[PDB]
Amino acid sequence: PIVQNQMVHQCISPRTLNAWVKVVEEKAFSPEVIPMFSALSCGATPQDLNTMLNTVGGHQAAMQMLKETINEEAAEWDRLHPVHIAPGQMREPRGSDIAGTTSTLQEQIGWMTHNPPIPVGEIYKRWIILGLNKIVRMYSPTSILDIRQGPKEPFRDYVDRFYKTLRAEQTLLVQNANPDCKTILKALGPGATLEEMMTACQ
Amino acid sequence: PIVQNQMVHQCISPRTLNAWVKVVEEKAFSPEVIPMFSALSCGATPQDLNTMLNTVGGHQAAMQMLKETINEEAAEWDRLHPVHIAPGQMREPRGSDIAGTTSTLQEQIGWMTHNPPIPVGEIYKRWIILGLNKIVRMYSPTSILDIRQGPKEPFRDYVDRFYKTLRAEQTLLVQNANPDCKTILKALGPGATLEEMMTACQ
Amino acid sequence: PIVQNQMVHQCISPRTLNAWVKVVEEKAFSPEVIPMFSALSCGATPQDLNTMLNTVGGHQAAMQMLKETINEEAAEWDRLHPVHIAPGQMREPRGSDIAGTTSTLQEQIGWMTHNPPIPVGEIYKRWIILGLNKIVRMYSPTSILDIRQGPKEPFRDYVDRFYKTLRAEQTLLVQNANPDCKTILKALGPGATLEEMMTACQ
Amino acid sequence: PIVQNQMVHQCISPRTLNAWVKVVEEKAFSPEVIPMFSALSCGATPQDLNTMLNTVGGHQAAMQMLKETINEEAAEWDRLHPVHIAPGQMREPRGSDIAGTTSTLQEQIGWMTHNPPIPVGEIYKRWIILGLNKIVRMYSPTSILDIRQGPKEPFRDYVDRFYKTLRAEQTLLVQNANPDCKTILKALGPGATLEEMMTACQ
Amino acid sequence: PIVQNQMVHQCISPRTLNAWVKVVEEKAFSPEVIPMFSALSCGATPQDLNTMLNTVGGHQAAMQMLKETINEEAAEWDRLHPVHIAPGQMREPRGSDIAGTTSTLQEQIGWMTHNPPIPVGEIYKRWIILGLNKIVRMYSPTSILDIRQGPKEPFRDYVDRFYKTLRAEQTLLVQNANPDCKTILKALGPGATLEEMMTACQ
Amino acid sequence: PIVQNQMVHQCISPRTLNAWVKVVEEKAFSPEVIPMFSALSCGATPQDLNTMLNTVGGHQAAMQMLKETINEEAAEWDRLHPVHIAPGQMREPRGSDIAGTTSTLQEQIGWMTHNPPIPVGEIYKRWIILGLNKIVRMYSPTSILDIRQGPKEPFRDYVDRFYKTLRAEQTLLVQNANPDCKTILKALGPGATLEEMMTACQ
């Protein structure tokens, strides 16, 4: 990453490398993996972003869809930012320079530490996260329409499932409740908070 | 977080990220999780606060009630602190800027490091903790009225349960004791410390 | 804690938080937990002291006796140190300011880093340790009078039990020995070291 | 490695040493091991590169093929860069100096920290990675021609295998699909993204 | 400990505390525990030395013999170094000040950082190690006279036992060997190295 | 060790201590332990080198052979470097000063940080490694002459054994192959690389 002592390059730590690889193994593409990726890549150069993605051993169908999303975002960058060099001067980054495939570590450090910065790590991280969200939505196993409260399922457990499914995918909470809790909820009237709905069905 | 070398931004550590995620998995919303959250988010920007909350994989009913509490506190902030910008100058934070949804990391660092600081991380952390306490009270399984000493339960074990329940929820200790220890406690008179009550029933 | 770079505030580390919580879970109130608490809270502000105590999930009977001891020590502080403020000036700490309930982190840092320091963390830590020792003595299961060497128990194992019990609670070692080792010990005469007693009964 | 405080030598950390040794034990020469090696050897001197390779306990057939690749690359270096010394002056590195066998740590630090740097660690790391890729291709158990979707294998699982095999080794995805998904894929027409192919066969 | 940034006090780390406690639990008073204690207490003040010893939960017979050795060494210090104070000046340390029982942390830091240092931590560590060696010799289960090679025990395994026992306790290696290896060893003549003895009996 | 902030003494870390002790327990004197020892003792003073060797609990036959090798190397040092002191001046190191038995930590730091350095840690580490290699060769269980490919053993697995044995101990690879792979290898002609031999017998 690039961090403060002036703004300097540091080696990606063995601990960050290991944390990312373990979250992916333990959680696959459950939605919470995305804000973990984002937090573990704080300050990341594009090189570091490629290291984290390249160190994942399975999920190669997912990694391949991610390259497609990366190439689409890169081509849209080249559309808005054509390039045309000057000895000892900085070249403008193209899509593939941002994605880390045709830029060196030194070019990346030079863009990221310029005054003002050309923030190639934050740009690439936005493309990667966009790709990762399409994958989370892909691998979401259930429609929110099939999250229905069981006859003897505690309301809380049902709400946990309902919002878990809705996060992976993205009135109806009440409709999908079981008869008994549904009746209690119809009676609360409009404008009930989730806290009030969950207290009523306890 | 923001910490001292002057006051600088540091990346949230893999170790803090991991600690928070594990305490939540192992303890759910037992009350002791709150002072752990508070301690692990020392110096946190609002961005970091959102990272810790977003990295929790289950308990999405709880996370949703928390957003409601956050939005209520944010709307009360906008009520007391309306906003109306000046080139190169700091804008005043609204509720949603404090909660980290419409403020950038740079705005957050600028508020938090101003002289005097606009402490957006400490403000948001107070809203989050308020939300978390309502959740601890929600998920508290037992009324203190149903904590009663068993016929052969050691007094200490009963007191542990009584104060555990009372912490999750928030004369009667003696009333809820078993006949034998109850008799010993009635005899101590008024003004007995817990230490004396527990010595008597040993 | 407060530590040296001048004397600065640092966030309590995830590793200290975790160490304290694990020693308590694994050892309860065996006496050795006290010097661990003392060592893990080196440099602690009163806020940090409250964090370590608040993060303990069970033993709420013990935590409650501890508050009683804290309030007693605080009331004795107010007896010896009454307070009576001056813009931009430091107020004198009362008992509850020392215990961290009515003082802010900033007041605590200001007392602890003053020339000369008002060492509010070391004062509160002494109250806490006093409370913790009363708890260690409470939860000590056995009188030293019931530590007696078994007919075929190795002398060393018996001495380990004898001093373990005596530490939790706080001529007789010989009296409580088994007939055979007792006879060997009577013969050594007065003025035998523990090393000599233990060599004789090997 | 060599890292920034000026550019200084630091001891390879016990944590890097241990991470490398564990990834090799747990993953052998699955392709993802290569970008892990590259990331764990950030800043590495040739000495450090030899330490990481020498600390691997099995796979000695692989380590021996790696020496062959190293010697070939070293001989090609000597072909393009003959050497011919001046008191207190730097000698030019030969192949075996780059590979760390006839250069000392001090010569290595002197090349790597010169203005401009003679980047002996990055040169040797490129040779090592080249050798490691030939080993990944060697130990790849399956041809992509034998990755065929099973009659009841979910399409995603098949794509994971297909791209896993293709990474170890390096129209046909559709050909190798099962009849039912093959028919759906023929109908999509040309120019389907992987995301669209995978949605269709869900 | 006291370490270099000038010479400053640092908090004993949770990791040192934990390492010491685990080596004692896993190894008791096997001899190798002594050089581990010595290495984990590098820079230790007497306070830190007491923390490491006080955090050990069992072996209280051993801890008590250790106090006896400490008091003997302290009384011998007072015999050679009597004391007789000057405002703002350093007092001379007595035995019990060195052992950490009547000296404060500040006195300890003042002795240890004086020009020239009064090295109270290194003095106390020598007393502790002396005590620890008497304990290692106490708990040594076997005389070297009962280490004899078994009829089918590999010579190496026997030598491992022989030197293990001799380290806990502190011509005969050959005498204690089995008939067959004994005969081979008699034939080597005088002046055989251990390497040659062990090669001969392979 | 001695490391850079100028060149300063640092305490050997609990993590290095623990890593060395675990590699020895898990790997004994498999050859890869040597470059791990060398890497974990980067910057080591002779004191640190003795700490790492003294903290090993078993293998005391091996530790004793190591002392013999150390004493031989030390006597050869005294043969080439006799000594003959000057107030406030540095004495010349003898063999036993280098090995850490008659030199203090301060003498060691003074030799190692002199301009030019008298590198007593690197000298002693070379003696130790020499001793360790004689031990690796001792404990090598098999001659390379008894590494022969089994009738149904994959060629790779056989090559792994062949080079594992050859590393512990230090045309024939082909001779020791099984009939079928032997025939394929005879046909390749002279000048086949290991990669080509291993491809042919796949």
Ligand SMILES: Nc1ncnc2c1ncn2[C@@H]1O[C@H](COP(=O)(O)OP(=O)(O)OP(=O)(O)O)[C@@H](O)[C@H]1O
């Ligand atoms: N949640 C946890 N609970 C218990 N132990 C943990 C946890 N997380 C990490 N550890 C311990 O810490 C190890 C990983 O981190 P480590 O202890 O090596 O810290 P470190 O990197 O040395 O700290 P620093 O970088 O500050 O020196 C693990 O092997 C484990 O023993």
